[PDB]
Amino acid sequence: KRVFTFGKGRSEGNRDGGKGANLAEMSSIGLSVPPGLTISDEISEGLDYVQKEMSASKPLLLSVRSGAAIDTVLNLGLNDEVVKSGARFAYDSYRRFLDMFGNVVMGIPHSLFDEKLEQMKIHLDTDLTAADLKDLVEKYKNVYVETDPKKQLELAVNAVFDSAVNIQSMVFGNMGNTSGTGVLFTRNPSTGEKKLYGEFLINAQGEDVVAGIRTPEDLGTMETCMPEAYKELVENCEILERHYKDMMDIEFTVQENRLWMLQCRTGKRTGKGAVRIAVDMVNEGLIDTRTAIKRVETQHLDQLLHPQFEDPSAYKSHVVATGLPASPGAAVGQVCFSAEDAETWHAQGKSAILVRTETSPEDVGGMHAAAGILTARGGMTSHAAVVARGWGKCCVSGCADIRVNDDMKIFTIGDRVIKEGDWLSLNGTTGEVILGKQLLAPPAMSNDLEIFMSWADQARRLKVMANADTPNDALTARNNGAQGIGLCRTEHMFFASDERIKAVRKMIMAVTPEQRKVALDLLLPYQRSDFEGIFRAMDGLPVTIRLLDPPLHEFLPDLEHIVNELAVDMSADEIYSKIENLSEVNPMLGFRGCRLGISYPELTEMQVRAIFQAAVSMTNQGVTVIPEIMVPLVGTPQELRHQISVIRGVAANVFAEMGVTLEYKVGTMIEIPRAALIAEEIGKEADFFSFGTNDLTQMTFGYSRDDVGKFLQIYLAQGILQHDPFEVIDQKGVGQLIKMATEKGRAANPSLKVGICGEHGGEPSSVAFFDGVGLDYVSCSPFRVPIARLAAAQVIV
Amino acid sequence: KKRVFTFGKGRSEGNRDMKSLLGGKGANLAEMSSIGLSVPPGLTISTEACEEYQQNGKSLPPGLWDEISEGLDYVQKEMSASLGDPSKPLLLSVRSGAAISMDTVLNLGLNDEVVAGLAGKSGARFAYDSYRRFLDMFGNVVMGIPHSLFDEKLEQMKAEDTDLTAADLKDLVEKYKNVYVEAKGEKFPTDPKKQLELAVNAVFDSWDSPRANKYRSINQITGLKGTAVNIQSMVFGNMGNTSGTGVLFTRNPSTGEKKLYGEFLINAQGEDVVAGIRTPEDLGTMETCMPEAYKELVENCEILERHYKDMMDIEFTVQENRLWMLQCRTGKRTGKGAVRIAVDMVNEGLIDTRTAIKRVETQHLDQLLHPQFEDPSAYKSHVVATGLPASPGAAVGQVCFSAEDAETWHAQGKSAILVRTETSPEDVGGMHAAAGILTARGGMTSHAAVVARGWGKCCVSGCADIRVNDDMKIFTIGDRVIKEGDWLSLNGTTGEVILGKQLLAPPAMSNDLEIFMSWADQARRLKVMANADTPNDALTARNNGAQGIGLCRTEHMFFASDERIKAVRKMIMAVTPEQRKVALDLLLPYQRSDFEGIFRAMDGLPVTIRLLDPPLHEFLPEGDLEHIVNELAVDTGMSADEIYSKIENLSEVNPMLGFRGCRLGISYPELTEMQVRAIFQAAVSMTNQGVTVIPEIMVPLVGTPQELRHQISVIRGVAANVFAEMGVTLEYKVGTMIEIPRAALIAEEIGKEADFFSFGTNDLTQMTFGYSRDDVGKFLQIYLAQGILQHDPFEVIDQKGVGQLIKMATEKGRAANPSLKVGICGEHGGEPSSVAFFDGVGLDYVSCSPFRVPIARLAAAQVIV
Ligand SMILES: [Mg+2]
Ligand SMILES: [Mg+2]
């Protein structure tokens, strides 16, 4: 009921205390596990089983060990009548029984005992005679005042149970040279090499190996001096790996050439090791590909996709702040306070860590040139984070304990000042901000990562598309495994040059239809060109381009300076009147999305023309183009229907003008709650849906993605929210709308395709949800594609 | 009888149940004749005849004309006139008619012989003009000659219309008759019988024509044989002494007095009174001149009301002492006349109360809820501009250009019309004191419109053709200058801006309105609560029939004085918890006081108070950032740097989705503690004064159960402290707004922890559509014009989308908490079409602003009966 025994060949419990379950199963596979008991009078009944199995209860020294699902007293049960095996060994164990019994159970500090040993000593403990231990025994006895086995255990069990319990027979590693204790991993936890990786200490007690007082030996010397025990250890290691089907971290004790197994748990491993060990164990036939896909956590894969620091622990004393892990990866460079200086420094070969209070669309140039980005404000889904995550570039955002003073070209963290040019390192996986130039780990030249991902690719049901707005980004996406473009944000296709920025600002500020017509035609080349490069890069793959959904305030550059730059790039009155007419109290719910293409169909005409102008031109250059055109911010069937009418109108003109007719698809964003509520009406008129879970989450919760920081931390602290809904998909709420739209849209159009291009498309827990809803694909930024690929597979296998 | 059915005074071969055999019109003529009306005699050729005409090779079936002749003998006999006889001419109209919707030829039977007789009875010019028009219409509708070709003869003659003699028209007639030969090659038929025959054939031919079949095949009119032909005697009121035309309402359309109300002209045609060539007279002059005809008119009017059970608007003609009923439709009426007539017809036993509730339109009722102008038509010559009807009602006062001067003038007894380009929250004081508000910029949802509509105060907004110059104390409409102090009148129902001091209608001795509303109250299922934030407004609400307060917006409870605004700004600008505590203590008295006044006004009724949901930017001073920081330091005492830093920390990109609602009370529970304390301190204080207090505390902008749970914990904590301190324990309820889509998606979880739901369809609609309620105007007009939206979703509830969430939350919450009460306090609560929807969903009540309560009351009743 309460006590669970285990011994040679027998085992009441199984692997399904944390140790009690492992000791039981490890004992049932026939290994030399010292017999013992596992508490959940009964300890007496079990003590009879452990007694008979050991032929002692003929002294029987015991040990008590604590063990939870998620300290140890050794050599208990020894008195003067208890003390066959050797005097030095006995008195040594006795002296250790007094120290460990008094520190763990009684409560006397170990310092008071080390004082007596230091006073007695000689230069080494191994030089002490048996008589010296006798004197040390008496000295330890005097420390108590300054005996019954049954009571020793009672007080030992009560003490261990203060903060389940395990009592086991004693195997002695302190009998002499042919005895000891050791630890190992069955394979290298850093590199994954299939070679025993551990230590061993002759003539010492359990934790003396790792205690550090003495220096352990290498396993290679155990093979030389103790071949019988090492021969059985090798066999036992391959035994444990063969049973659990995984690399192991074990504890073992040798008692006069008699190998005893004590503890064994699954080995914690690095990203490199997780993959190499997974790949090898597959080649070895040990595990199938299903299990292998489970053995590499998304955090493992994430480590192998970006640069890493050699040893995070080795710089803990240099961390000056901790922010949000906006985009994973390590970065090292010199402090910089402006995007302009980043591009300049990068052009010269200097690595720049861009540090700012906040990034604007103007800084996209310098953000791409910086090795890493550090921002004081903004969340994980902020603009800087998405762009950084898409580039696989290190970013630490929301560093609240930093104040930037761009005028004085310095930033402070409390009372410390870090000046421009000082070397700074960022850890985008942990958010740590470290002073100085820290070590990077070397990239893996492993073909293993490629092989492993091919298993996940062949295993996943979901396709993984990419969110890329430029030809170069689209190429990177395909290199990372993207099966197409799920979202090309057309509004984000004018950041490159002053030429492009001037064109957009001409369109935004346009007042007369003559002014707008000039701008839309001036934009046509940029769209057709940029759209052209993507089609060929994704040759043979679907490309979903979305109509403009601009943040009007974002395209704007003192009020006079703003108006000044616009006139350079119309009359002062036209600009002042237009700035007044464009300002919105809540632009996130204002004049954007398809509301823009509907009010001004000439704008949608240019884009659609530029798309087919590029599609036909590239098809004529041998490219297989599979284009899709998607409408943003739809809430009614009329909105989509209205825009589709324009698309097909341009389709007729384009195909006839160029003498080539292409098949194309037309679809809609599902990022408005209403769109999902009447999705059966939209499904009839749409070829595909793509959930925009950024806006949808915002509309469902009423959370302004910009201003949510005012209270998200309080909501998280008080259990109101279990996650940032902008990071982890809300299954109860947002997910209900997703299921609704998916089921409704497919019931109306069985050939409907359904995807997700919101930021949750790249979040593992959300990917598993999308797979459950039965979505056809997910779409995420380029450097998140491999994560979604593995996530899309782990939920399947 | 078989194919030809005669009708007219004393004759009715058909009946009302023959809409498909006769025409729709042919069936009405048959019914009007049976109920005893003075119908000019005529005959209806059935649709069977048309079908036989189509199946007989586009020729009149045998034996049909002899029936048409027998029916002609009736009309001739009844009228003592004959086709073609100039001594006693008979002229016919020919109207087509099917069973439902799908041209007329007048004065058929007219030729050179007949016209001479018509000239002897009606006048030479009139006879030859009618002959002219007949040639045109008959030549076009029956012969196929376009009117465009006839206008050539007239233009050519006029070269060598109302300024043309009769001798000229007799010649112009000759030109028209030549158009027959010069176009169709054949001659104008002079025999009346031949004209009719041709007219009948042309009607049956018009049935199977293209465009005509396109209308049926496109729309898909199931099961239609053909058109009937309605041939009716013409009748003239310009035939001398004993003739005339008139119009009337069977009751006064302005007052509802049961008394014929109309005009009458002796020896004139219907269009003669419209053109205004002569001035009509009172029906009394008819009772004197033609006592018999008038006596017959009184009997016809009594038949009309008896048959139609309503007041009627008619056209009648007296031809030679014989009264003829030509037209009649339900008479339009004012609100005052709508109610009185409805009440009188109930007392009269002519209709029951169920019908009466359907007769008074919500728009009728609204006229009686605000001041009115005595006679709108009488000031058309003074209208200088028209804006948007932001808030209905009349207003009259002297022009003023600042909210400050409005309060001053009001305090002195002067009626002030506040004129501005735009109102800001600073102007609430003067806007409340102004008789009416006029703004040059802004839409129906603009600041002036929202605030004015809530007060039931007249407002005309968006008057784009006015420019206000408050410095020079003038505003202009083109070249006209309207100076400060000039008398101006506003019509917030029509948007009219009228110069001068116009007359107001006298107050009503309206016991009828009270009686009528008691019928609607006894009929409606929904309760109607009120949205009021002040004691007076809550008192106003109850006087207007409110059964309680469905929503008291606490954020709207500090516009009254500088003291209160200074207090709020101290809370907003608070940095340290010590600063905030000081501010909250300054607010506690104002909250407790107002809650006492509200509770006392609603003695015995439920009062739902909502926790703060403030627009932070709204409480900040207007003007340039420098002036704001200066004014805040004065009110707060903080340094210029502290204020600049705080304003920066308060700014939000999208405040409507930002740090507001319950997110504020959760982050700062001391705020919720102050409010809740003020509530129960007031509840007990009023309870000790004999007031029955039924308080409810509502949480705003809830999207999760934890948010509501968190705040309820605070409510119950303060309730215990207050009750213990004051030695009195009151029962209270705690509930939530359902104005976030997620709240409805997981409403089963929130229902377990809420006593009531109140749908906030303003935010809910906004979140559902993604429409910024402020900035939606950027594109709403285009969406409405292009059929994208059928309505402004902020005005009419979106049943497919927002309504789906309402049904969801209502059903989920009640399944989780059977004792849950469900209401609606969004602006749709006062919109008739939305009220009917809420009744269908099974909501328990609607809540709307005070002066909209009577509207929701009537609406809640009209959807039931
Ligand atoms: Mg979006
Ligand atoms: Mg609200």
Residue numbers in the entry:
A (entry chain B): 2 to 17, 23 to 46, 66 to 82, 88 to 100, 107 to 119, 125 to 162, 167 to 191, 199 to 215, ...
B (entry chain A): 1 to 102, 107 to 164, 170 to 874
What's the paper's own text on this?
Previous studies emphasize that PPDK has a modular structure consisting of distinct substrate binding domains for PEP/pyruvate at the C-terminus (PBD) and for nucleotides ATP/AMP at the N-terminus (NBD, aa 1–340). A central domain (CD, aa 380–515) catalyzing the phosphoryl group transfer from ATP to pyruvate–or from PEP to AMP–via a phospho-histidine intermediate mediates a catalytic cross-talk between the distant substrate binding domains.
At the same time, NBD2 is displaced by about 40° to accommodate for the new position of NBD1. The hinge motion of NBD1 and NBD2 results in the closing of the large cleft formed in the open configuration of the PPDK monomer. Besides, the NBD of monomer B exhibits additional density in both the mFo − DFc difference map and the feature enhanced maps (FEM, see methods section) probably reflecting a bound adenine nucleotide. However, since the molecular identity of the bound compound was not fully resolved at the present resolution, no compound was placed in this density in the deposited structure. The presence of two structurally distinct conformations of the PPDK monomer (NBD open versus closed) within a single crystal structure may suggest that these structural asymmetries reflect functional asymmetries in substrate binding and/or catalytic turnover in the individual subunits of the PPDK dimer.
